[PDB]
Design a protein around this nucleic acid. Sequence first.
DNA 1: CCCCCCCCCCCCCCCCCCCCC
Length: 243
Amino acid sequence: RSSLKEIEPNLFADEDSPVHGDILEFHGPEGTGKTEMLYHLTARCILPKSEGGLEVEVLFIDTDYHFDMLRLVTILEHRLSQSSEEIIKYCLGRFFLVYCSSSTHLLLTLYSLESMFCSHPSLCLLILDSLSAFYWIDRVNGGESVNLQESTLRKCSQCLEKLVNDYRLVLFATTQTIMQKADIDYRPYLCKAWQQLVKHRMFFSKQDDSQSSNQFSLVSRCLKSNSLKKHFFIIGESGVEFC
DNA sequence: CCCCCCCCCCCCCCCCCCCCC
Ligand SMILES: Nc1ncnc2c1ncn2[C@@H]1O[C@H](COP(=O)(O)OP(=O)(O)OP(=O)(O)O)[C@@H](O)[C@H]1O
Ligand SMILES: [Mg+2]
């Protein structure tokens, strides 16, 4: 019922099999277009089929409290050929947002979301933002024992893998670059189960030069085939546009 | 792996005549 190529032919030019459970990951520093990419994916997924959409529902989980409905509405109205309030209402009728305040809160939200997931059959995409939102607090609360710094993340990863395997969903996660290492910059620090659960990896970067910005770099790295690709794209009032 | 800063030195080098009872 779900096809990965249709979601994004630009980035997913190799994956053509009907997706029946995948885990992806975004990574990079601040202000490099991760949330804009998520907005573009949601816009591609929730638009009507007449305007070039997918007509399936999206679930969103916000952890860093950085979601902006105004930007999403602006992108939707710019992508639409004709702007009308009722069509925007129809589009937004298939969008859901959840807030979590702590690791246990997120764990219980995951333990509760399966009721909706069995209730709603049209869900095809799942987004978790800022998976590394609670790292320092958990680490400090865990003392010097590593196993006490990893339990909540372990349980959340197990629940996420169970959900994605059971309900045939697509997961999009975001992490933050917090620590360096004594061309890809990546110093893994997450849970071992989460690290081994990843399938695709994408890194984000921004041009240092001030050519009015308008240039972002993305490096796609799939662990299945060890294929490294570089993408260039721009972000405008209508969303993101690939160079 | 984790976060932010310091401070001056030292002297050189001469030119140029005027005016008769
Ligand atoms: N209307 C717009 N036109 C052009 N660029 C825009 C517009 N709106 C936002 N941007 C760009 O969006 C960029 C930030 O993107 P975004 O909010 O997705 O960051 P991010 O990589 O997800 O970072 P973080 O998660 O730390 O917030 C800015 O650098 C800005 O130039
Ligand atoms: Mg962001």
